[PDB]
Amino acid sequence: CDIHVLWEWECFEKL
Amino acid sequence: EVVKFMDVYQRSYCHPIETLVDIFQEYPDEIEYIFKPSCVPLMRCGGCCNDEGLECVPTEESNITMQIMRIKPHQGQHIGEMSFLQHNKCECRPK
Amino acid sequence: EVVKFMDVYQRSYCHPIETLVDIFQEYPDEIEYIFKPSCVPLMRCGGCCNDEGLECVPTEESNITMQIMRIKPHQGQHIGEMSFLQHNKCECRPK
Ligand SMILES: [N]
């Protein structure tokens, strides 16, 4: 996900 | 009882939040005077971004005018309008 | 169009207010870690007492525990519990 915008949870389980 | 991760993350993420600001921060020329109240509630960008390389900054601003008392040593009380900057929208941008 | 004195005065007077706090301010020993979020929302004393010599202090506290992620670009992420102090009551007290 774009680092500049508020994330959903999948943005974090793609870390 | 434990706050869930996504709740924390969403609540702290960069946004305009009511912040109690000391009038002298905004009006540093006036430190030898006394204001009542001495601090004012403003909407200001706060919280955090997804990366320590980004910062939470205003992308829309406006003025708010408030009725504030000011007194200089040995003078009488004045009261009047004082204007302060508010943050209406915030975004995370490179530092 | 102008916020009235008393409204400013009440709204800025010493009370507990939602404050966005960087985790390293609370856990400075932990700067070897990248936390996500990097800041947390906490009820904390803020505002003014309007009477230098009077200060806005916590008079009651509790803890709150939150799920925070700790990451390492090499390693996989962990999610852990971190506890923080909250201010439940604030009062204007002689410095
Ligand atoms: N990841």
Author numbering:
A (entry chain P): 1 to 15
B (entry chain W), C (entry chain V): 13 to 107
Recite the paper's sentences:
In the present work, we focus on a class of monocyclic disulfide‐containing 19 amino acid peptides targeting the Vascular Endothelial Growth Factor‐A, the main pro‐angiogenic factor in Human. We proposed to use this peptide as a model to rationalize the thermodynamics of α‐helix stabilization by an i to i+4 lactam bridge. Although only lactam‐bridged ExxxK, DxxxK and KxxxD induced the formation of stable helix in the unbound state, all peptides of the series were helically folded when bound to VEGF.
Constraints caused by the lactam bridges and by the binding of the macro‐cyclized peptide to the VEGF site also made the α‐helices non‐canonical: in each of the four peptides, the residues P8‐11 folded into a 310‐helix characterized by a H‐bond between Glu P8 O and Cys P11 HN. Interestingly the lactam bridge cyclization caused the side chains of residues P10 and P14 for peptide 1 c and 3 c to be in a non standard rotamer conformation, the consequence of which was moderate steric clashes involving hydrogen atoms. Therefore, lactam cyclization can result in sub‐optimal geometry with remaining steric constraints, where the side chains did not adopt the standard conformers (1 c and 3 c peptides). The real space correlation coefficient (RSCC) of the α‐helix was higher than 0.83 on VEGF:1 c, VEGF:2 c and VEGF:3 c structures, which supported these models. The backbone RMSD of the 20 lowest energy NMR structures, compared to the co‐crystal structures of bicyclic peptides and VEGF (see below), indicated that the bicyclic 2 c and 3 c were significantly closer to the folded structures than were the other peptides. The location at lower ΔH and ‐TΔS of the preorganized peptides 1 c, 2 c and 3 c at 20 °C and 37 °C directly reflected the lower ΔG values in comparison to the other unfolded peptides.
